[PDB]
Amino acid sequence: ADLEDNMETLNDNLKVIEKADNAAQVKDALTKMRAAALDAQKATPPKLEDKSPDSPEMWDFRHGFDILVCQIDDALKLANEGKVKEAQAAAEQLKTTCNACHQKYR
Amino acid sequence: ADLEDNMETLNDNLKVIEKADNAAQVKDALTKMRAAALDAQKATPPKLEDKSPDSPEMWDFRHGFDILVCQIDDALKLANEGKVKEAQAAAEQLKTTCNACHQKYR
Ligand code: HEM
Ligand code: HEM
Ligand SMILES: CC(=O)Nc1ccc(O)c2ncccc12
Ligand SMILES: CC(=O)Nc1ccc(O)c2ncccc12
Ligand code: NI
Numbered sequence: 001a002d003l004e005d006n007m008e009t010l011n012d013n014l015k016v017i018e019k020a021d022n023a024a025q026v027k028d029a030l031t032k033m034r035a036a037a038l039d040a041q042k043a044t045p046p047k048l049e050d051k052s053p054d055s056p057e058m059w060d061f062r063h064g065f066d067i068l069v070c071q072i073d074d075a076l077k078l079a080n081e082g083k084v085k086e087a088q089a090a091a092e093q094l095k096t097t098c099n100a101c102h103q104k105y106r
Numbered sequence: 107a108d109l110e111d112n113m114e115t116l117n118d119n120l121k122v123i124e125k126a127d128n129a130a131q132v133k134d135a136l137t138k139m140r141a142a143a144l145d146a147q148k149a150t151p152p153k154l155e156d157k158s159p160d161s162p163e164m165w166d167f168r169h170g171f172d173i174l175v176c177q178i179d180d181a182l183k184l185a186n187e188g189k190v191k192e193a194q195a196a197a198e199q200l201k202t203t204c205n206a207c208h209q210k211y212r
Contacts, residue, residue, distance in 0.1 A: 056163060056210075057162060063169075
């Protein structure tokens with residue numbers, strides 16, 4: 001999927017997590033988020049079509065996703081432990097990463 | 107210590123590790139390396155005095171050290187396990203990181 005498609009998946013599964021009643025629901029959402037983030041990692045944002053592929057901006061763009069995935073896996077660990085409330089909190093804390101990358105490259 | 111001083115510590119403790127007879131020797135060297143890398147992380151290379159402190163180049167410069175420290179800790183884990191030969195091998199593998207950062211910012 002393109003960058004846009006993946007971003008929507010991420011954005012939509014965040015609210016889904018924000019409404020979840022149980023762990024299984026959070027896990028599903030987070031699992032979908034993880035996949036989309038990895039796939040997004042491969043795209044080249046429109047604001048970096050120029051910059052060479054090995055550009056320092058690009059590496060920061062891709063590195064942004066390794067942080068999101070690490071964060072996402074921690075949320076899954078929590079969801080896996082039945083701690084639904086803090087798996088949700090962990091979910092929110094992801095926005096920090098989201099925003100960070102958005103103001104530099106979006 | 108300045109960037110230069112720290113780099114020398116790193117460079118010299120690498121050979122020391124390359125000559126070590128035992129684990130304790132590797133650990134000492136690596137411990138000195140870890141400290142110097144962290145301290146180096148704070149300096150601003152001469153080729154980045156201009157670029158703003160929050161510059162994408164700077165963050166890559168500092169991030170370079172988080173990789174070196176992670177690598178260094180893995181070497182210590184190995185040295186801690188008595189595996190002197192592979193703690194040494196792990197040591198060498200560090201050069202990849204060293205070079206990488208050198209050709210971009212040195
Ligand atoms: C964090 C989990 C996260 C969310 C949520 C998110 C959402 C998001 C939206 C809603 C858009 C709009 C896309 C559209 O037009 O439909 C958007 C756009 C971009 N994002 Fe994003 N995004 C999240 C995380 C990240 C991360 C960690 C990065 C950087 C590694 C990133 C980057 C981008 C870019 C580029 C765009 C613009 C895409 C385009 O203009 O085509 N996002 N994101
Ligand atoms: C890896 C373990 C590593 C070694 C070894 C190393 C050595 C090294 C030397 C020998 C110099 C010369 C410094 C001097 O003039 O005495 C040097 C210089 C720089 N380095 Fe280095 N260095 C290692 C690792 C790293 C890493 C991971 C970075 C980046 C995060 C880095 C950066 C630099 C920079 C900048 C210089 C130049 C300093 C200056 O010109 O004042 N090094 N390094
Ligand atoms: C969960 C988390 O914060 N992860 C990370 C933080 C900082 C980094 O530089 C990372 N780099 C590569 C992969 C994960 C990283
Ligand atoms: C041992 C090792 O390779 N570490 C790392 C690899 C890649 C990263 O992006 C990292 N980020 C922050 C800290 C360590 C990192
Ligand atoms: Ni990293």
